[PDB]
Every structure is written in structure tokens, then in C-alpha cells.
């Protein structure tokens, strides 16, 4: 076991090295900042066309159209300002767990419990919407998808691996393999140069797309982590776990920075998102409601209680004008 | 106001009525989840009926449309996707009755049954559990006793009471005997009258659901 102890020595060395740089305790640096106050938001729209519990959603960069998927076998594209249904796509396998919406707006993607990522062409001739590609090769179940270009997409699967594809060829360009449990979430950096993932190891890793190597590993949670999201600067991210706790990590200091927990919240977090300035942090819970946190002070600043079942998805527009939340309730609201 | 937005509203209404029709059409089917241990009887039950990630099967019997989902080809954390099947009409659990000797296997089947019966999502759904391979059990019961798997069995080594003992051991594993029912059937590889048993169990489930909806329950 001479080679099974050098790992322990290196772990101790890493712990000491990143404990030698901890001298500030962020909550002790933001002591003089003034609190945000009380954040009070009202629902502006209710979007009701689904006949089952919706599992994912995504905003368009237009900041007006969004897509949502449910176990009813449909994903349908909405117009937020008027609540008009622009499209309604019948999809082949009813067990879908994720959605994505291309930055250009020409395509959408879907996937789920059938091990396949499907890509649909929205802006086609001849009228209707068609299936462009159908990417196979995972062995688990699609957990998340994110478009890079019109011809590139990173996927996360419950077979412990992530992958990078090119859509016209249909083959995996690169595979990232360092986790030991299922991979449940994914987040692209603002410049799409490197991303971060969260698995059922209670650990998160930082990959770079151009070389397929893990750069850093972040630990500190106590259970499965279900959500992940970058800070708008691209130099930190937040996580959400079954631990009933979120927490903020730092890519340059290489360690935890703060934790967001309450003594009377004993339930897991399903989703996580930030604000346009990155000052307050949203988080969806299984308590049928989602909390708003003050990211620089850890205090609670509000509550969004308008659903009658678990909130399973949550997103904020690119212009920071509204937030949308879906739930197993089968509705999704827009809060401004 | 609403210059050519009226065409958009009309399109929304048309696709909305199409969604309503599709939902109504899909709300009159019974969905069945097919569980079981590793290669117990799950393959032959699909042939008893008319017939990557999961495999769906369709069939009809007396003006009723069925749907079996087999999720045995997906090895991963089961607690991360088992809540998708909440609301399934019933569960079909296949147990190999002749695997009380090989390895232990019956104890694994018992552990799986106990884990699935007392789950946080399936606290209400009923179970239709088959005991496959009773002819091999006929053959093997005389050669070797049933005390190999149950050390506390006190009875003759004949099929007629060993089968009842095994059935009772499976029956008495559920902690809610006033809320969920368990239907047992000693099936085999021939005389395909199993779909009638499934039909009767599903009809009882449907009657109970209707009673709950009407407010009488």
C-alpha cells in the first residue's frame, strides 16, 4: 500500500496549503455593508397548459420566450409577455428530466430516462418542428444539458460521466471522467471556456472544455448536491444539496467562502440561481416555496410562496427583470 | 390593439384544445411498473401478456389499454429517479420460487420487496406479485428441504404447504395492511390466464379510485 498512502499525504498537503490562505472570513469583511432590506415580489403571470408535473425549464437570451418540459410527454414554448403558446412539441419518451434553449434561438434540446439527447429544429421551412439529431452513447440518464454553439453541447449523465458532443457528426468529442457517483447538475461559465459539475459524491469539480482535464475539486457538503450555478463575474459558484444547505465556493482562493442555512429548514434544495448583479441568491426547496438570500451577508431577505407542491426548477432572465419557477404543482409563475 | 396578435391568440387556442384532447386520451390508460430481482421471471411475464433506458409494452384485454414499463436495464441510484413513477396504477413484482437454494437469492428478493413496499412514494399503490417456476419447485422440494433458506420452518417438505409458507413470508412484510392490498398468484410458463388476474386486480383498484374521487371514501 506504498502507493495508497501518497494519496493521503497529498490530501493533507492540499488541506494545509488551502488552510494557510484562510485569514479573512468573508462574513467579517461584509460587516459594515448595509442590508438589502425586505424583498417583496408579486406574481405577474401564471402559465397553465401542462397536465403533469414539470421537471425543467430554460429562458431564451431574447428574455421573452421560454421552454418547459413535463412528464405529460410535451415541451411547449411560451411567450411570457402575453402567455401565448408559440409551439408545442410531442416527444417520443415521456420520461424527460431536462431542457435547454439555444443561445441563437434556432434549436432546443431534451433528454431524460431513455439515455438520449434529442435536438429539435425550431426555425425550419415547411412549417412544423423536426428532430434534427439524436445523440446516443450515455449509459445512465440525462441530468442536464447546455448549448455552447449551434453545433456543440455538453451533457451530464447518471453514469458518472459528462461528455462534449458535436451535433452534425453525432459523436462524443471529449469525455470527462472523475466522479464516483451520479452527476446531477452542470453550469457553463459566462465565456463558456470552462464549466463546473455537481455529483452525488457531495463534491464538485471544475473542468475545461478545450482540454478535458479536471482542474480543482471542491468538497464540504454532507449529502448529494442537486444544483450548481456561477457567480456573474465567473470567479465563484453556489451549490444546493439534500443537506438543506447552500454554500459559496471560490475558484481563486480554492475553498468554501460562506454557507446559507436556517435552523428551521430541514429539507433539501432542488435548484439555485443568482441575480443580475449577484447580490442576492434564489433557491428552490421541497417545502413548496423558495427563499431569497443576501449573498454577501447570509441573511434571508424574502420568500416566494405561491406553489402547492415541490418547486423543481427556477431561472432568471438575462436582463434581470423577472424570475420564473416551475413545480410539481403543474403550473409555473413569473415573479417581478 | 391586437392587430395581428389575434392570429397568435387563435393559434394558441387551437394548440390548447389539441393539448386537452391528448390529455383526455392519455388519462384512460392503466400504467404498470414491472419490478423484480435479477432474472427471476420478468422475461416470461412479458410473453404471457399479448405483447436502452426503459422498455415500454402495450396490449389490450377486454376494452382496456395497458402499459408496462420495465426499468431493469438502468443501473444507477434508484432513489434519484424512482419518484417519476409515483401515481402508477399498480406494481408487478416477479419472484422466482425455485431460487431458495442458489446463492440467499430469496433473501435478496425479500430485501428488494421490503424496500419497494415501504417506500415514501408507493405508500398507497397495490402490488400484484407472481411466484414463477412452480414446476421446478415441485421437482426440487423433495430432493432438498426448505430449511436451507428458512431455519425455523416446522412442517413437511411438500409443495402444498411450503408454497403457502413462502407466500405468507412475503405477505407479512407490509406495514400498512389497512391501506394497500397484495394479490398473489402461483403462475407458471403455460396456461396463460395471468392477464385475467391482472385485469381483476386493476378493476378493484379502479373501483377504489372512483370511490375516492366521488367523495364516498
Amino acid at each position, epitope marked *: 500500500d506504498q502507493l495508497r498512502q501518497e494519496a493521503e499525504q497529498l490530501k493533507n498537503q492540499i488541506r494545509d496549503a488551502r488552510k494557510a490562505c484562510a485569514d479573512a472570513t468573508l462574513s467579517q469583511i461584509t460587516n459594515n455593508i448595509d442590508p438589502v432590506g425586505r424583498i417583496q415580489m408579486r406574481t405577474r403571470r401564471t402559465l397553465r397548459g401542462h397536465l403533469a408535473k414539470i421537471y425543467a425549464m430554460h429562458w431564451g437570451t431574447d428574455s421573452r420566450l421560454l421552454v418547459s418540459a413535463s412528464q405529460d410527454g410535451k415541451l411547449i414554448i411560451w411567450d411570457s409577455y402575453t402567455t401565448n403558446k408559440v409551439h408545442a412539441i410531442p416527444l417520443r419518451s415521456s420520461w424527460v428530466m431536462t431542457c435547454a434553449y439555444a443561445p441563437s434561438g434556432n434549436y432546443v434540446a431534451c433528454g431524460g430516462l431513455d439515455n438520449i439527447c434529442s435536438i429539435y429544429n425550431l426555425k425550419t421551412r415547411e412549417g412544423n418542428v423536426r428532430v434534427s439529431r439524436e445523440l446516443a452513447g450515455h449509459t445512465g440518464y440525462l441530468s442536464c444539458c447546455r448549448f455552447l454553439d449551434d453545433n456543440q453541447i455538453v451533457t451530464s449523465s447518471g453514469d458518472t460521466t459528462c461528455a462534449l458532443w458535436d451535433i452534425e457528426t453525432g459523436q462524443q468529442t471529449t469525455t470527462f471522467t472523475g466522479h464516483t457517483g451520479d452527476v446531477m447538475s452542470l453550469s457553463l461559465a459566462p465565456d463558456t471556456r470552462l464549466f463546473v459539475s455537481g455529483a452525488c459524491d457531495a463534491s464538485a469539480k471544475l473542468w475545461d472544455v478545450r482540454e478535458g482535464m479536471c482542474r480543482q475539486t471542491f468538497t464540504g457538503h454532507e449529502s448529494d448536491i442537486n444544483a450548481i450555478c456561477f457567480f456573474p463575474n465567473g470567479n465563484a459558484f453556489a451549490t444546493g444539496s439534500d443537506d438543506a444547505t447552500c454554500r459559496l465556493f471560490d475558484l481563486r482562493a480554492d475553498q468554501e467562502l460562506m454557507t446559507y442555512s436556517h435552523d428551521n429548514i430541514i429539507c433539501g434544495i432542488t435548484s439555485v440561481s443568482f441575480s443580475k448583479s449577484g447580490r442576492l441568491l434564489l433557491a428552490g426547496y421541497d417545502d413548496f416555496n423558495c427563499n431569497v438570500w443576501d449573498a454577501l451577508k447570509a441573511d434571508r431577505a424574502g420568500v416566494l410562496a405561491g406553489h402547492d407542491n415541490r418547486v423543481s426548477c427556477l431561472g432568471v432572465t438575462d436582463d434581470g427583470m423577472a424570475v420564473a419557477t416551475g413545480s410539481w404543482d403543474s403550473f409555473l409563475k413569473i415573479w417581478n | 390593439l391586437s392587430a395581428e396578435d389575434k392570429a397568435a391568440v*387563435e393559434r394558441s387556442k*387551437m394548440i390548447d384544445r389539441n393539448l386537452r384532447e391528448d390529455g383526455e386520451k392519455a388519462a384512460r390508460e392503466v400504467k404498470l411498473l414491472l419490478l423484480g430481482a435479477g432474472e427471476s421471471g420478468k422475461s416470461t411475464i412479458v410473453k404471457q401478456m399479448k405483447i436502452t433506458g426503459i422498455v415500454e409494452t402495450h396490449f389490450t384485454f377486454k376494452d382496456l389499454h395497458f402499459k408496462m414499463f420495465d426499468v431493469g436495464g438502468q443501473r444507477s441510484e434508484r432513489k434519484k429517479w424512482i419518484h417519476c413513477f409515483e401515481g402508477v396504477t399498480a406494481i408487478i413484482f416477479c419472484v422466482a420460487l425455485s431460487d431458495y437454494d442458489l446463492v440467499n437469492r430469496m433473501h435478496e428478493s425479500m430485501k428488494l420487496f421490503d424496500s419497494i413496499c415501504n417506500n415514501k412514494w408507493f405508500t398507497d399503490t397495490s402490488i400484484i406479485l407472481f411466484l414463477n417456476k412452480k414446476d421446478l419447485f415441485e421437482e426440487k422440494i423433495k430432493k432438498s428441504p426448505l430449511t436451507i433458506c428458512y431455519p425455523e420452518y416446522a412442517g413437511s417438505n411438500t409443495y402444498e404447504e411450503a408454497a403457502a409458507y413462502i407466500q405468507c413470508q412475503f405477505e407479512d412484510l407490509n406495514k400498512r395492511k389497512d391501506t394497500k392490498e397484495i394479490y398473489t398468484h402461483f403462475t407458471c410458463a403455460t396456461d396463460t390466464k395471468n392477464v385475467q388476474f391482472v385485469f381483476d386486480a386493476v378493476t378493484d383498484v379502479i373501483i377504489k379510485n372512483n370511490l375516492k374521487d366521488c367523495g364516498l371514501f
Partner: single-chain antibody
Amino acid sequence: VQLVESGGGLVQPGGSRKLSCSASGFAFSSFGMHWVRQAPEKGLEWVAYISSGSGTIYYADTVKGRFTISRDDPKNTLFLQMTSLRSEDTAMYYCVRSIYYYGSSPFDFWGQGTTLTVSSSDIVMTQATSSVPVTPGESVSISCRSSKSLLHSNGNTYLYWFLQRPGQSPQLLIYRMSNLASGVPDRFSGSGSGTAFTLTISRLEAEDVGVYYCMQHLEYPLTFGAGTKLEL
């Protein structure tokens, strides 16, 4: 994508006729369809409109009562029943494909035309010029003008530009005054405030010679312009 019309020919005044438009190559039941006609040596003029699902129909005031529009979705055909044909109905009839949702481009594909011969508060769109001589490589501008502000309270101005080359059917260029239809080279551009619009062609070669029309989609009936012709 194809639209083919049939049912023309010489008719006597007071008679009746029926035209057909057989569509093949696109999802027919998702598109609303129009009938547009053009006199022997004159501009275009709208006739009738049948929505998707047949839930809405409109007619021009000069044909209301005598004409009837209907569609048969399973057969992929569009009909127009004409009765009491007077001598003013001599024209060529086009079949036009149009779909409306958020961000679509209606009026994009036109049929090919069938010629019919009969024996012997509206918004006014003004296209003052009627001909301009041009040279290849230069830049040309074309101006339209409306009697009412085409800007709506939701920020959309509803102005459309078409092109009809010699011997062919017209073709969409710009929709809602600034958007380029797919397949149109980026030489063309559109601009202008409410009640005054302009089309700009930069570095124009051959195959840009024809008549340019200007249409409003703010409210029915839809009205066209007189047309500006570019000669060589």
C-alpha cells in the same frame, strides 16, 4: 414547397367559376391562406382570407357577397367560388401562404397564378415615384408613404416590401419594416419612422429589375401601393 392554381379561362359576364390551389410540400393545415389578384397592367389587390382551422374569414368590399373562400385540409386544396362575374374581375389570381406567431414572417411564399378573362376608412398607401433609371454597382432608394401611422402601441410597425421580377410572381423582401426574409441577400435594407418609409439597395446588379410594392398589415382590408419600377 409548391402552390399550383387551376380553374381559369374565358367566361361570360354574369356566369360563375371556381379556382383551386393545390399545396404540396409543407404543413398545409398550419398556415392561413390569401387570394390576391392583379389586373392585366396594374398593381396587386387583396381579395379574401381563410384562417387556420377555418375560424375566421375576411373579404374585400368589392367582392363581398359574390365570392366565397374555403379549404379542404385532408386534400390539401384551397377553393374560391365566384358568382356574378362582371368585367372588372379580369385578372391573374395568386395563392399566398401566411402563418402568424411571435416572430414569424407571413406572406413569404406566393403561388404561380391562374388567369381569368371575363368577356365584355381604408388606409391609402402612396408610392409617388413610378420609374427610375439605374446603373449596376450604384445604390438606389425607394420611398413609400401611408395616410395613417403604422406604428402600434406594442412597438411594431407593419410594413412589407415585395419584388415582382418580369414574368414571375412577387417575392417577400422585408417584413415589419426592418427584418430580412430568409434567402434575401443583405444588400437590401429597410428603415423609416411611422408614416414615411424607405427601401435601400446597395451595389445592385442585374436580376434586381422589376416592380417594388409596399403593403400594410395593420388592419383589414390589406392595401398595397401603386408600385415603383426600376428599368435598365
